[PDB]
Design an enzyme around this catalytic site. Structure first.
Site, PDB file in Angstrom:
ATOM      1  N   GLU A 171      -3.926   5.031  -1.174  1.00 49.01           N
ATOM      2  CA  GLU A 171      -2.779   4.236  -0.763  1.00 49.01           C
ATOM      3  C   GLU A 171      -2.207   4.679   0.575  1.00 49.01           C
ATOM      4  O   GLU A 171      -1.612   3.872   1.300  1.00 49.01           O
ATOM      5  CB  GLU A 171      -1.697   4.259  -1.844  1.00 49.01           C
ATOM      6  CG  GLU A 171      -2.166   3.730  -3.206  1.00 49.01           C
ATOM      7  CD  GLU A 171      -2.970   2.424  -3.131  1.00 49.01           C
ATOM      8  OE1 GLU A 171      -3.371   1.909  -4.202  1.00 49.01           O
ATOM      9  OE2 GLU A 171      -3.210   1.909  -2.019  1.00 49.01           O
ATOM     10  N   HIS A 194      -9.163   1.981  -8.290  1.00 49.75           N
ATOM     11  CA  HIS A 194      -7.831   1.547  -8.682  1.00 49.75           C
ATOM     12  C   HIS A 194      -7.909   0.638  -9.897  1.00 49.75           C
ATOM     13  O   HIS A 194      -6.957   0.538 -10.671  1.00 49.75           O
ATOM     14  CB  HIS A 194      -7.152   0.828  -7.516  1.00 49.75           C
ATOM     15  CG  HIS A 194      -7.094   1.644  -6.259  1.00 49.75           C
ATOM     16  ND1 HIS A 194      -6.489   1.194  -5.104  1.00 49.75           N
ATOM     17  CD2 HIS A 194      -7.584   2.875  -5.970  1.00 49.75           C
ATOM     18  CE1 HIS A 194      -6.608   2.110  -4.160  1.00 49.75           C
ATOM     19  NE2 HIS A 194      -7.270   3.140  -4.660  1.00 49.75           N
ATOM     20  N   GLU A 245       0.840  -1.188   0.000  1.00 50.63           N
ATOM     21  CA  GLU A 245       0.000   0.000   0.000  1.00 50.63           C
ATOM     22  C   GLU A 245       0.883   1.248   0.000  1.00 50.63           C
ATOM     23  O   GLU A 245       0.646   2.198  -0.757  1.00 50.63           O
ATOM     24  CB  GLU A 245      -0.903   0.017   1.239  1.00 50.63           C
ATOM     25  CG  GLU A 245      -1.880  -1.158   1.352  1.00 50.63           C
ATOM     26  CD  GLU A 245      -2.920  -1.187   0.228  1.00 50.63           C
ATOM     27  OE1 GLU A 245      -3.150  -0.131  -0.397  1.00 50.63           O
ATOM     28  OE2 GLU A 245      -3.509  -2.263  -0.014  1.00 50.63           O
ATOM     29  N   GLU A 289     -11.084  -0.204  -3.862  1.00 50.29           N
ATOM     30  CA  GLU A 289     -10.449  -0.834  -5.018  1.00 50.29           C
ATOM     31  C   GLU A 289     -11.130  -0.634  -6.374  1.00 50.29           C
ATOM     32  O   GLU A 289     -10.530  -0.906  -7.412  1.00 50.29           O
ATOM     33  CB  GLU A 289     -10.245  -2.329  -4.745  1.00 50.29           C
ATOM     34  CG  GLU A 289      -8.981  -2.894  -5.383  1.00 50.29           C
ATOM     35  CD  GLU A 289      -7.703  -2.221  -4.875  1.00 50.29           C
ATOM     36  OE1 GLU A 289      -6.619  -2.510  -5.430  1.00 50.29           O
ATOM     37  OE2 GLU A 289      -7.775  -1.410  -3.923  1.00 50.29           O
ATOM     38  N   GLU A 339      -3.182  -5.731  -8.362  1.00 54.30           N
ATOM     39  CA  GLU A 339      -4.511  -5.606  -7.772  1.00 54.30           C
ATOM     40  C   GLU A 339      -5.559  -6.504  -8.434  1.00 54.30           C
ATOM     41  O   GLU A 339      -6.061  -7.436  -7.806  1.00 54.30           O
ATOM     42  CB  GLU A 339      -4.962  -4.139  -7.825  1.00 54.30           C
ATOM     43  CG  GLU A 339      -3.901  -3.161  -7.316  1.00 54.30           C
ATOM     44  CD  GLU A 339      -4.267  -1.695  -7.532  1.00 54.30           C
ATOM     45  OE1 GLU A 339      -4.841  -1.365  -8.595  1.00 54.30           O
ATOM     46  OE2 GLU A 339      -3.963  -0.869  -6.645  1.00 54.30           O
ATOM     47  N   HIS A 390      -4.659   3.272   2.981  1.00 55.11           N
ATOM     48  CA  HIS A 390      -4.403   1.848   3.123  1.00 55.11           C
ATOM     49  C   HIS A 390      -3.150   1.531   3.932  1.00 55.11           C
ATOM     50  O   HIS A 390      -3.120   0.544   4.658  1.00 55.11           O
ATOM     51  CB  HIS A 390      -4.323   1.205   1.744  1.00 55.11           C
ATOM     52  CG  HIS A 390      -5.599   1.291   0.964  1.00 55.11           C
ATOM     53  ND1 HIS A 390      -5.694   0.912  -0.357  1.00 55.11           N
ATOM     54  CD2 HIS A 390      -6.833   1.725   1.319  1.00 55.11           C
ATOM     55  CE1 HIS A 390      -6.928   1.112  -0.784  1.00 55.11           C
ATOM     56  NE2 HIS A 390      -7.638   1.605   0.215  1.00 55.11           N
TER      57      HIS A 390
HETATM   58 FE   LIG Z   1      -5.253  -0.394  -4.654  1.00 52.17          FE
HETATM   59 FE   LIG Z   2      -4.586  -0.369  -1.969  1.00 51.96          FE
END
Ligand SMILES: [Fe+3]
Ligand SMILES: [Fe+3]
Ligand SMILES: Oc1ccc(F)cc1
Ligand SMILES: Oc1ccc(F)cc1
Ligand SMILES: [Fe+3]
Ligand SMILES: [Fe+3]
Lengths: 510, 388, 166, 388, 510
Positions: A127, A229, A97, A226, A192, A130
């Site tokens: 991030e 992302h 992360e 997510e 991911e 995270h």
């Molecule tokens: Fe991510």
């Molecule tokens: Fe992440």
């Protein structure tokens, strides 16, 4: 004179126009690709609204942790093996992360379209969120759990062991070192989409099954972030499909990213899941087959075919090596247990049946080895025995892949049993597969990571552990342990008794 | 089913008992403080420090790192994932910095979220109270739509200047502060647009299109040098510290503070504009919040570093001289905007005094911290030449 | 046909509809309150519906009083033409001149049965309520437990029908 | 110990096993919607309605009640806990009211908490940004520390005016709105003091004591008439609705809106004072918030009651007239405040334009709702007749 | 230019001066006391800080509820009996919290000092919060529980039963009707200090024991606000302690307040606790003694002695009538089960042993009766038997105290068995104790509450239930039940076919 306001999408409609033209308005990082100047993003967000939707998630998350979960003693009522697993799972993901923070800052720099920049920007903040979320899980387990050691200092105790090195490859350096696009493939298109998203959910399942409600609370929250992302990784492919260079390099970079990720997570995640838990959720093999082959190699890759994306040429080998990889690795992780920041356990009778049932042949190979080690007293501090010795006596050298950092024992592994040893300009290099080898041969200056055997050569085991603070607060008991019981914990002196000295296995070659 | 299919180890009788039976009689270590090994900035270790410090996997060869060895994979050519080569500044420990506001992700988005929701409440109350009626039409359509509007690009450019530092920062504490300094800048640019969008809803004929403000920014005279400075700070500086330092401790501290505080915040009220000041309050709150972090990193940690203090001050002094000129130029061109105001709005004396306020605050808050010798009247005199 | 909707309640919705005179309505309400409210009611035959009925009358009396009185009056003149402030000051006097709780309680209750809105304006009514009530409590709560239950029952004038205490 | 001596039924194997064995295969009723019998004001029932509607145990003899019978205990004399006798207004249902903002306790305190935390952040930015420098020494020490402060006792008085309503309100939905209308009013009064307190910390000789602003309120001539209107609305009215209606749909809508908006909100800026406007922004946001509740109660519900529409309007028109005069007076005595202002501050041309805004808004939002035919020119005339 | 701000305490210092003297500056309510205008409050809060500390609490509470508790299905894994118990506890306490709003409003109007007005104000807001919190509990159990009926419409279905009448006395009318000070004693001096505050904690205890993690999450949060209400009830006595009327009236309103509250909670709370649960926390007798005698009657009241406050004269009497009160009440509650909005259960074997063990003699009285009813089929719809019938057959009249509204059966009771019947101006009145009788004899116009027998006289049982909506969604099955199992639920018809018609028990004396 009626009550009126303005929302995020109303301001976002003009965001693309925020950027303007000027000679030096170009990315500061090297790249073979040119991201489209008119690329757009999927979610029409602004800083204010982004903050608000994340803040709402935090309320629920921290609310659950601080109140109900704390009242329920959820930090304690978790299986010992899983409490240990989360020391690695949470801290290692923390670095993934974290590096993803700098990774997306770099993508934000690469993008020229205001909207594509803004898409990545949202991940940069995600991030960071995270990194702090993952740190919170270790923070919570250290404060309220059965064994804070490791949970309370992984950021420094992780440096003692070999498993950490490979992690920094796929979730650290692999995220920010190289072509921005290459880095994006490792992070988003593969990292991911193929592993992280399915992984986060899978971890919450294994957690709940083992009594852990802390991780589901935090990770399920991370999972709701997510979606953005996934759109970023997808827009990277779209922002470059119209560039002539894309047809020349896209598949090459994708294939390498694929192998990089798979080489480490295939064996490590399976190991964490099956050997780091009491209650099993699903055999790693079928889980892998679904993720990599169906949900990604077919579903996810097929959608991007319209942009020139093909299926990884190394996917075949990855599968052939997959099946036993995690089993091969745990033998090594357990043999080198004194170099960790967590406590390991031998498979119990109930588990050996499970392993053998889901992986025929597991007992005649791994099962018997573990039984012998138990007999040798690997769990007892007065036995004067550590599995590493068994590898010495039986002439089974352990090497470290110069590229992936993944430890391997070719003369004992049921998966890849290949070994390539080269000498170049006064240095020796050991590889475990034909893809890692190509990478080094073509990009020697990218892979100079010194391995633990190289750095620890000639050092007595206990001295290394002591130097790197691998001890509990008593200053004598080892953080790492060969069993998860509460009594008979090995001490620094029990390692000293043994007088084990590190040696570089590659020095034997002439 | 009412109970579901998945059994959970915490509530499932059979699984819980299996778990409870394997539990030790007490914790295997009584040290339940994550980050206990971190040197506390204040009396006791804070949650902000525990969750942040050392998250960045630096090896000891990057000042203050606890790991060892090279990176696993580097860039083609050999460049390290992170390394000393990305900035001229040196220190004994890149992890010494501390955001005085101790902001980690949760507190950060929490505060911004409150500001957001209150902003929405404020606008609905503003439109419902019909306060727009007493605002001068010229100020509204010319100075807010065009000139305040063009300034969004200035903030946007400064936001973008942080993109490389987000990637190159040599520690978690610095990376987090830098990311937050830049995120606050884009927020302000969006609040400038939000105001314009709001006006288009309560003012018949007000165009929220950015076309006019953008043309003012890209081709006008008033912001010409400002844009040249911003384009430079953003794309001509590859050193993540030169970027952050020059932006916040030179350009934004002089030019930005003048524009936001000594022009718009100072004059909007004179034209019945209470709307713009509402957003400038946010921008100014953000500025003071960043200033604390900026001072800690560059003055308390780098400028006062026990081993590289002299070196770092010399370098920052170098950067101040390098960017003071383009900043003076930006202020000089901005002086042209005063000629466009209705006669009697303000005078040369008020304007000069307001410039001395910005220059004096800068000298006390920034220049003096690195012993940079600034001549206030010389700086002000150079800017005034721009008054048409 | 019981708790909220019943024959008897209906009977009064019709009986009140025939009232089209502030005079009549105000009178009926007054009589109604004398007939069915408070422990001193003339009878308990409507006990289960009186509270609801009384309100439906206050309603008719309110609507009329409004369409009959004027600005100044609706605020200071009762539905009986009486001058609010006057009555208030009068009742408070009698109350403060009360010799004992037995006399005081009769003043207060009587005041409510007669001047309860829509009769007297709310403003004066509740103000009286604050003063009258205060007097009543002061006399009642003084040496509250001195009088034994046996004697207290005779004072209340209650008819004892049964007693048992082991 | 690590496990604790207390066994919990959700996690204890033995106890949970017993619990699970007693559970039914499925819920004993599929209607899992609390307050499902409530008549929704919108498309679907809202959380606000579920958690609020019918919390008050009124019986059917109080319009809307669902319970039956008399109260269990009453006041010495026979006075009911809650009764139709506490207000001149009548309706088919006291539970028809709905706060358009749908505020139950949680959302309410959430919003105010954000404002509080941002307020603190803002103040720390203001003081750090030295914005006080552009502040007129007179306005500060005089109009703010004396006339602004004194206005706090005005808001405070309107705060207390809600006390009886909080006790006598005939329904949950109306009681909660009322409580929030009053709580907001005291908040503002405390904000007024907050500023005077802030100014004290940054201005060397500024005295925070309420001594001055109070005497000005108790003896001054500027508010004298206003203070008399307050006292009456608070202590002379025993009808909870009359008190709520008059206070919000008359007094504060005219005098209040003028003193806050048309005077301080429109002038403070001209003296280099963005501080005070920050707080007025809150007070006006609150006013517009309360206004929607007030409108829905007295107009949508009472004024347009399917059975007492005419009756109620008559009473509200009556109440309007009753308090419209003391309101005019409060204003007149307030007009004598521009005289203390330095020449050039404003002219009768403006003062007139503003007054007409207040009156026009008032007529547009309140007066015309109950058909209280009023004369704007006459009103402004009577108020304006108070200038020097 | 140092960063500066201003806190609540700094603004509150001048709050007292906010009020100003003038003619009609006095309370609008009847009172015999004079609250000093120089009284101060303990907590120096301003509206904004109050909202903040409460908001922070909400965050934790709702976060736990919407997240971890829902994921754990906490709304379901609760014992059936307790799910039913919470319908009453939460909703009954809600009305208390709700009338407490009007009470503190009336109190706010009473106080003359700005600070004392501010204190009550904080509670006015707190009580609103508590109203919504209690409402949220029923709302949560309705939305996610094993039986929504009751939780979903208690606000109207509670009007069918007799237990609700007594609740309105102690937590509604007792809170707002009468001298402001008398109402304060019932609310804060007695109700809150002696019962509510200790209760709320107890409730979370019983809840936890029975699988209920929802109530603890909400009630413990409500508990955090009580330290302010205590200060309010304390400052109420302090503000009138100097007034001469105090020495002449205080202890009288207090004794009446004590008796009023205990009269209801002594039997009702113990009943809810011991009979509304499977797992026991502590015998009610032991609990009552500690609360009423020690905590309150001892430590709490003792500290108020310096202000002329003495132990209620009816204390010894209350302790006398207490021992069996709750046991006596449940017989009536179960016998009249069709009038509730919840499902009741008869003691199982382990429970009967528990009852006998802690209440010697319990079995020979209550136990035998319950086994007789069960064998006769009180649980089975096809039996045509409702325990009320048993009371009629054995000539055991059930009366409703005209004052407290508490149901009592003198001929069967093991506790108090006194009964006083009177006629006044054509109306009969039944009293269960000397204190209530005095209250009525002295203040006849304060107590004219019609009882269920009076209102339901002549009405057939199923007709009253249908009219008041005592039905579940299918429009036929009763909300109330004589057991807590999932099968054989009683229907309106099962009740109609019995032809039970209500009779006014007092007419037997005619
Ligand atoms: Fe991510
Ligand atoms: Fe992440
Ligand atoms: O619990 C664990 C921790 C580390 C690992 F590699 C396997 C299992
Ligand atoms: O679960 C319950 C519900 C009501 C009652 F009176 C006793 C127990
Ligand atoms: Fe409460
Ligand atoms: Fe309370």
């Amino acid at each position: 004179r009626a009550p009126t306001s303005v929302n995020a999408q109303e301001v976002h409609r003009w965001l693309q126009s925020f950027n303007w033209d000027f000679k030096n308005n170009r990315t500061k990082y090297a790249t073979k690709y040119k991201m489209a100047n008119e690329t757009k993003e999927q979610f029409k967000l602004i800083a204010k609204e982004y903050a608000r939707m994340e803040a709402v998630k935090d309320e629920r998350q921290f609310g659950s942790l601080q109140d109900a979960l704390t009242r329920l003693n959820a930090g304690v009522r978790v299986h010992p093996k899983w409490n240990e697993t989360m020391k690695v799972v949470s801290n290692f993901l923390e670095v993934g992360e974290y590096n993803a923070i700098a990774a997306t800052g770099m993508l934000w720099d690469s993008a020229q379209a205001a909207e594509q920049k803004n898409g990545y920007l949202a991940q940069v903040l995600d991030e960071i969120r995270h990194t702090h979320q993952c740190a919170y899980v270790n923070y919570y387990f250290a404060k309220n759990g059965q064994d804070p050691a490791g949970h309370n200092d992984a950021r420094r105790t992780r440096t003692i062991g070999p498993l950490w090195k490979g992690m920094k490859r796929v979730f650290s350096d692999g995220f920010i070192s190289g072509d921005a696009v290459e880095c994006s493939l490792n992070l988003q298109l593969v990292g991911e989409a193929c592993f992280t998203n399915p992984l986060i959910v899978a971890v919450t399942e294994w957690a709940a099954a083992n009594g852990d409600e802390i991780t589901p609370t935090v990770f399920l929250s991370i999972e709701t972030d997510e979606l953005r992302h996934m759109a970023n990784g997808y827009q990277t492919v779209v922002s470059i499909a119209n560039d002539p260079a894309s047809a020349k390099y896209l598949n090459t970079d994708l294939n390498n990213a694929f192998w990089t990720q798979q080489k480490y997570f295939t064996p490590v995640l399976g190991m964490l899941f099956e050997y780091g838990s009491k209650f099993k959720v699903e055999p790693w093999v079928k889980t892998w087959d679904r993720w990599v082959y169906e949900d990604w190699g077919g579903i996810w890759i097929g959608r991007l075919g319209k942009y020139g994306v093909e299926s990884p040429r190394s996917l075949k080998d990855a599968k052939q090596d997959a099946y036993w990889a995690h089993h091969d690795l745990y033998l090594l992780a357990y043999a080198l247990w004194p170099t960790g920041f967590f406590r390991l356990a031998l498979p119990d009778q109930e588990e050996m049946e499970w392993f053998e049932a889901n992986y025929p042949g597991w007992y005649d190979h791994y099962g018997k080895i573990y039984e012998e080690w138990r007999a040798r007293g690997c769990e007892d501090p007065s036995s004067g025995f550590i599995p590493l010795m068994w590898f010495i006596e039986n002439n089974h050298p352990i090497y470290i892949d110069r590229v992936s950092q993944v430890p391997f024992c070719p003369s004992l592994a049921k998966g890849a049993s290949t070994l390539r040893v080269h000498e170049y300009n006064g240095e020796m290099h050991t590889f475990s597969d034909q893809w890692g080898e190509r990478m080094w041969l073509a990009e020697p200056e990218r892979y100079e990571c010194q391995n633990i055997f190289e750095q620890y050569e000639g050092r007595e085991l206990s001295e290394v552990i002591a130097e790197l603070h691998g001890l509990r607060s008593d200053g004598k008991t080892l953080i790492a342990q060969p069993h998860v019981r509460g009594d008979k914990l090995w001490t620094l002196d029990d390692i000293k008794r043994l007088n084990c000295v590190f040696k570089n296995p590659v020095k034997a070659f002439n | 089913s009412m109970l579901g299919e998945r059994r959970r180890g915490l509530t499932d009788p059979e699984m819980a008992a299996v778990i409870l039976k394997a539990l030790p009689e007490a914790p295997l270590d009584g040290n339940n403080k994550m980050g206990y090994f971190v040197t506390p900035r204040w009396k006791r270790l804070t949650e902000y420090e525990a969750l942040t410090v050392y998250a960045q996997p630096n090896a000891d060869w990057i000042a203050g790192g606890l790991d060892w060895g090279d990176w696993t994979q580097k860039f083609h050519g050999g460049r390290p994932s992170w390394g000393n080569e990305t900035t001229e500044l040196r220190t004994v420990d890149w992890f010494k910095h501390r955001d005085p506001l101790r902001r980690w992700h949760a507190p950060y988005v929490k505060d911004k979220a409150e500001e957001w929701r209150y902003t929405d409440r404020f606008l609905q109350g503003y439109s419902a109270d019909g306060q727009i009626r007493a605002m001068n039409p010229t100020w509204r359509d010319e100075f807010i739509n065009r000139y305040w509007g063009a300034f969004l690009f200035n903030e946007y450019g400064l936001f973008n200047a942080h993109s490389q530092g987000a990637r190159e920062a040599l520690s978690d504490v610095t990376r987090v502060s830098l990311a937050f300094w830049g995120f606050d800048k884009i927020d302000i640019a969006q609040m400038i647009q939000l105001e314009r969008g709001f006006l288009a809803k309560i003012v018949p004929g007000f165009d929220e299109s950015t076309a006019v403000p953008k043309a003012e920014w890209t081709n006008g005279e008033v912001y010409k040098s400002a844009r040249l400075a911003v384009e430079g700070l953003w794309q001509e500086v590859f050193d993540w510290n030169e970027s952050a330092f020059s932006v916040h401790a030179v350009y934004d501290a002089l030019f930005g503070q003048f524009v936001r505080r000594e022009f718009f915040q100072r004059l909007a009220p004179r034209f019945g504009d209470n709307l713009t000041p509402f957003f400038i309050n946010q921008a100014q709150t953000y500025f003071q919040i960043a200033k604390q972090g900026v001072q800690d990193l560059y003055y308390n940690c780098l400028g006062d570093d026990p081993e590289f203090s002299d070196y770092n001050r010399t370098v920052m002094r170098n950067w101040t001289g390098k960017w003071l000129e383009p900043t003076i130029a930006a202020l000089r061109d901005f002086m042209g905007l005063f000629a466009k105001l209705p006669a009697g709005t303000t005078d040369k004396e008020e304007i000069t005094a307001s410039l001395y306020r910005v220059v004096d605050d800068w000298i006390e808050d920034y220049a003096s911290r690195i012993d940079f010798k600034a001549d206030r009247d010389q700086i002000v005199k150079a800017v005034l030449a721009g008054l048409k | 046909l019981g708790i909220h909707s019943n024959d008897t309640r209906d009977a009064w919705v019709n009986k009140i509809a025939q009232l089209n005179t502030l005079e009549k309505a105000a009178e009926m309400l007054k009589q109604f309150r004398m007939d069915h409210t408070t422990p001193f009611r003339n009878s308990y035959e409507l006990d289960n519906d009186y509270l609801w009925i009384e309100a439906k009358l206050e309603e008719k009396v309110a609507v009329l009083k409004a369409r009959a009185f004027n600005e100044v009056d609706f605020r200071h003149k009762t539905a009986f033409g009486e001058d609010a402030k006057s009555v208030l000051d009068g009742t408070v006097a009698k109350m403060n001149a009360a010799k004992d709780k037995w006399e005081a309680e009769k003043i207060h209750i009587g005041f409510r049965q007669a001047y309860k809105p829509p009769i007297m304006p709310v403003n004066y009514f509740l103000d009286g309520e604050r003063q009258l009530g205060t007097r009543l409590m002061e006399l009642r709560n003084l040496n509250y437990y001195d009088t034994p239950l046996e004697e207290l029952r005779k004072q209340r004038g209650v008819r004892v029908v049964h007693l048992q205490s082991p």
